[PDB]
Design a protein around this ligand. Structure first.
Ligand code: HEM
Length: 154
């Protein structure tokens, strides 16, 4: 799959808004992931004790993790497809140490889209959402191929 420059610009235009407060967007996205698919929280040994959204919102470490996650994703999106180097370390740690199934990467992609759709109607209309979905599908496709090369393809 290959995105056009126009599609990448729609992706980078809404990411620019996420960057106005990456910590707040990361909290919303991780909390939306854990609430919609609670089995995903079990993969975090640092955060699986959190019982409620209030506990998640008050966790300073979770917030800092959200910033780490979205900043790594932003660096991958800014590469506009040329993200081979960025995907190596990510795929190795997610396939071998954290053990994250592609289906869970699908879940977080769904959470990212949900949060952008509600926080940014001005930059996340139908065409912009379609472009972001395309960029995240490319990210999952390339990550899955790497998983396979690493011996996981889960
Ligand atoms: C857009 C997708 C994702 C990105 C860009 C992302 C990014 C990161 C980054 C940069 C780290 C820290 C460095 C590393 O260990 O590689 C990290 C750690 C981790 N990620 Fe991901 N991640 C993503 C999705 C997920 C998903 C869906 C899960 C689980 C359902 C997950 C679980 C973890 C865990 C368990 C850690 C370690 C947390 C800790 O510090 O305690 N990741 N992720």
């Amino acid at each position: 799959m290959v995105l056009s420059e126009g599609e990448w610009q729609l992706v980078l235009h809404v990411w620019a808004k996420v960057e106005a407060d990456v910590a707040g967007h990361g909290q919303d996205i991780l909390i939306r992931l854990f609430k919609s698919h609670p089995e995903t929280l079990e993969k975090f040994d640092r955060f699986k004790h959190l019982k409620t959204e209030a506990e998640m919102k008050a966790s300073e470490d979770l917030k800092k993790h959200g910033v780490t996650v979205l900043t790594a994703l932003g660096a991958i999106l800014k590469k506009k497809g040329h993200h081979e180097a960025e995907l190596k370390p990510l795929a190795q740690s997610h396939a071998t140490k954290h053990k994250i199934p592609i289906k869970y990467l699908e879940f977080i992609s769904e959470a990212i889209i949900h949060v952008l759709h509600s926080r940014h109607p001005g930059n996340f209309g139908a065409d912009a959402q379609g472009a972001m979905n395309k960029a995240l599908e490319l990210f999952r496709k390339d990550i899955a191929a790497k998983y396979k090369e690493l011996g996981y393809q889960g």
